[PDB]
Amino acid sequence: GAPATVTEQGEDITSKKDRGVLKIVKRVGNGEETPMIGDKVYVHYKGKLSNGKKFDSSHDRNEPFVFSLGKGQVIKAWDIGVATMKKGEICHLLCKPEYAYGSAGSLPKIPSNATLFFEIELLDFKGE
Numbered sequence: 001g002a003p004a005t006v007t008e009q010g011e012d013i014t015s016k017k018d019r020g021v022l023k024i025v026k027r028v029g030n031g032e033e034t035p036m037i038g039d040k041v042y043v044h045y046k047g048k049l050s051n052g053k054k055f056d057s058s059h060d061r062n063e064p065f066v067f068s069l070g071k072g073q074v075i076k077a078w079d080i081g082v083a084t085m086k087k088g089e090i091c092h093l094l095c096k097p098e099y100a101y102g103s104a105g106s107l108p109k110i111p112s113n114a115t116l117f118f119e120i121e122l123l124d125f126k127g128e
Protein backbone atom coordinates (compact mmCIF):
# COMPACT_ATOMS: atom_id res chain seq x y z
CA GLY A 1 0.00 0.00 0.00
CA ALA A 2 0.94 3.63 0.10
CA PRO A 3 3.00 3.40 3.36
CA ALA A 4 5.09 0.56 1.93
CA THR A 5 5.58 2.48 -1.30
CA VAL A 6 6.89 5.66 0.38
CA THR A 7 9.09 3.50 2.63
CA GLU A 8 10.65 1.74 -0.36
CA GLN A 9 10.47 4.43 -3.05
CA GLY A 10 10.43 7.77 -1.23
CA GLU A 11 13.05 10.47 -1.32
CA ASP A 12 15.07 11.36 1.76
CA ILE A 13 14.38 15.07 2.40
CA THR A 14 16.42 15.39 5.60
CA SER A 15 19.49 17.59 5.83
CA LYS A 16 21.32 14.83 7.67
CA LYS A 17 20.55 12.27 4.97
CA ASP A 18 19.53 9.74 7.63
CA ARG A 19 16.40 8.62 5.85
CA GLY A 20 14.30 9.85 8.74
CA VAL A 21 11.73 11.62 6.54
CA LEU A 22 10.83 10.17 3.15
CA LYS A 23 8.55 11.86 0.65
CA ILE A 24 6.62 11.13 -2.54
CA VAL A 25 4.89 13.94 -4.43
CA LYS A 26 1.45 12.64 -5.39
CA ARG A 27 0.21 15.82 -7.07
CA VAL A 28 2.45 18.58 -8.34
CA GLY A 29 1.42 21.93 -6.96
CA ASN A 30 1.59 25.44 -8.43
CA GLY A 31 4.79 27.13 -9.58
CA GLU A 32 8.03 26.97 -7.74
CA GLU A 33 7.44 28.76 -4.44
CA THR A 34 7.46 26.92 -1.14
CA PRO A 35 6.44 28.55 2.16
CA MET A 36 8.86 30.51 4.29
CA ILE A 37 9.69 30.20 7.92
CA GLY A 38 7.02 31.81 10.00
CA ASP A 39 4.34 31.60 7.37
CA LYS A 40 0.83 30.61 8.38
CA VAL A 41 0.29 27.35 6.52
CA TYR A 42 -3.10 25.69 5.96
CA VAL A 43 -3.13 21.97 5.29
CA HIS A 44 -5.40 18.97 5.13
CA TYR A 45 -3.94 15.68 6.27
CA LYS A 46 -4.59 12.12 7.30
CA GLY A 47 -2.20 10.14 9.54
CA LYS A 48 -1.74 6.39 9.91
CA LEU A 49 0.25 4.16 12.23
CA SER A 50 2.29 1.21 11.11
CA ASN A 51 -0.48 -1.10 12.34
CA GLY A 52 -2.75 0.40 9.67
CA LYS A 53 -4.80 2.53 12.12
CA LYS A 54 -5.91 5.95 10.85
CA PHE A 55 -5.19 7.96 13.95
CA ASP A 56 -6.17 11.46 12.84
CA SER A 57 -7.62 13.39 9.93
CA SER A 58 -8.40 17.05 9.38
CA HIS A 59 -10.78 16.12 6.57
CA ASP A 60 -13.03 14.40 9.08
CA ARG A 61 -13.18 17.70 11.11
CA ASN A 62 -14.24 19.79 8.13
CA GLU A 63 -11.51 22.38 8.82
CA PRO A 64 -7.85 22.64 7.90
CA PHE A 65 -4.93 22.33 10.29
CA VAL A 66 -3.13 25.63 10.63
CA PHE A 67 0.36 26.26 12.00
CA SER A 68 3.33 28.60 11.67
CA LEU A 69 6.08 26.89 9.67
CA GLY A 70 9.51 26.18 11.12
CA LYS A 71 8.68 27.01 14.74
CA GLY A 72 8.44 23.54 16.30
CA GLN A 73 4.62 23.80 16.53
CA VAL A 74 4.51 20.42 14.80
CA ILE A 75 6.75 17.38 14.69
CA LYS A 76 10.10 17.82 12.99
CA ALA A 77 9.09 15.77 9.97
CA TRP A 78 6.28 18.25 9.23
CA ASP A 79 8.43 21.33 9.60
CA ILE A 80 10.85 19.70 7.14
CA GLY A 81 8.22 18.21 4.85
CA VAL A 82 5.75 21.04 4.51
CA ALA A 83 8.71 23.38 3.78
CA THR A 84 9.28 21.37 0.58
CA MET A 85 5.69 21.70 -0.70
CA LYS A 86 4.14 23.97 -3.30
CA LYS A 87 0.61 25.39 -2.99
CA GLY A 88 -1.83 22.73 -4.12
CA GLU A 89 0.64 19.89 -3.73
CA ILE A 90 -0.34 16.58 -2.19
CA CYS A 91 2.46 14.44 -0.78
CA HIS A 92 3.03 11.30 1.24
CA LEU A 93 5.50 11.52 4.16
CA LEU A 94 7.00 8.66 6.10
CA CYS A 95 8.30 9.89 9.45
CA LYS A 96 10.67 7.80 11.61
CA PRO A 97 10.18 8.32 15.37
CA GLU A 98 13.25 10.57 15.69
CA TYR A 99 11.39 13.11 13.50
CA ALA A 100 8.05 12.45 15.19
CA TYR A 101 7.23 11.54 18.81
CA GLY A 102 10.26 9.39 19.61
CA SER A 103 10.22 7.09 22.58
CA ALA A 104 7.60 9.15 24.40
CA GLY A 105 4.83 8.74 21.89
CA SER A 106 1.75 10.88 22.18
CA LEU A 107 -0.97 9.32 24.19
CA PRO A 108 -3.49 8.05 23.66
CA LYS A 109 -3.10 7.39 19.94
CA ILE A 110 0.61 7.25 19.17
CA PRO A 111 2.77 4.56 20.82
CA SER A 112 6.46 4.68 21.63
CA ASN A 113 8.89 4.39 18.78
CA ALA A 114 6.18 4.92 16.13
CA THR A 115 6.87 5.45 12.43
CA LEU A 116 4.07 7.69 11.06
CA PHE A 117 2.58 7.95 7.58
CA PHE A 118 0.84 11.11 6.40
CA GLU A 119 -0.95 12.27 3.29
CA ILE A 120 -0.72 16.09 3.29
CA GLU A 121 -2.30 18.66 1.02
CA LEU A 122 -0.87 22.23 1.18
CA LEU A 123 -3.89 24.45 0.76
CA ASP A 124 -2.33 27.86 1.25
CA PHE A 125 0.50 29.73 2.92
CA LYS A 126 0.69 33.36 3.92
CA GLY A 127 3.09 35.68 5.75
CA GLU A 128 1.63 37.33 8.85
Ligand SMILES: COc1ccc(OCCOC(=O)[C@@H]2CCCCN2S(=O)(=O)c2ccc3[nH]c(=O)sc3c2)cc1OC
Pocket residue numbers: 045047056065073074075078106
Ligand atom coordinates in the same frame (compact mmCIF):
# COMPACT_ATOMS: atom_id res chain seq x y z
C1 LIG B 1 -6.85 19.55 19.86
O1 LIG B 1 -6.01 18.36 19.78
C2 LIG B 1 -4.82 18.57 19.14
C3 LIG B 1 -3.67 18.93 19.83
C4 LIG B 1 -2.46 19.12 19.15
C5 LIG B 1 -2.40 18.94 17.76
O2 LIG B 1 -1.26 19.10 17.05
C6 LIG B 1 -0.23 18.58 17.80
C7 LIG B 1 0.89 18.65 16.85
O3 LIG B 1 0.73 17.57 15.95
C8 LIG B 1 1.68 17.31 15.11
O4 LIG B 1 2.77 17.83 15.13
C9 LIG B 1 1.34 16.36 14.07
C10 LIG B 1 1.67 16.93 12.73
C11 LIG B 1 0.65 18.02 12.32
C12 LIG B 1 -0.78 17.53 12.32
C13 LIG B 1 -1.11 16.90 13.67
N1 LIG B 1 -0.06 15.89 13.96
S1 LIG B 1 -0.51 14.41 14.42
O5 LIG B 1 -1.44 13.92 13.44
O6 LIG B 1 0.67 13.67 14.60
C14 LIG B 1 -1.40 14.54 15.89
C15 LIG B 1 -0.70 14.66 17.06
C16 LIG B 1 -1.39 14.75 18.29
C17 LIG B 1 -2.74 14.70 18.24
N2 LIG B 1 -3.55 14.76 19.31
C18 LIG B 1 -4.88 14.72 19.03
O7 LIG B 1 -5.76 14.75 19.89
S2 LIG B 1 -5.11 14.60 17.40
C19 LIG B 1 -3.43 14.61 17.05
C20 LIG B 1 -2.77 14.56 15.89
C21 LIG B 1 -3.53 18.57 17.05
C22 LIG B 1 -4.74 18.39 17.73
O8 LIG B 1 -5.87 18.01 17.04
C23 LIG B 1 -5.97 18.68 15.79
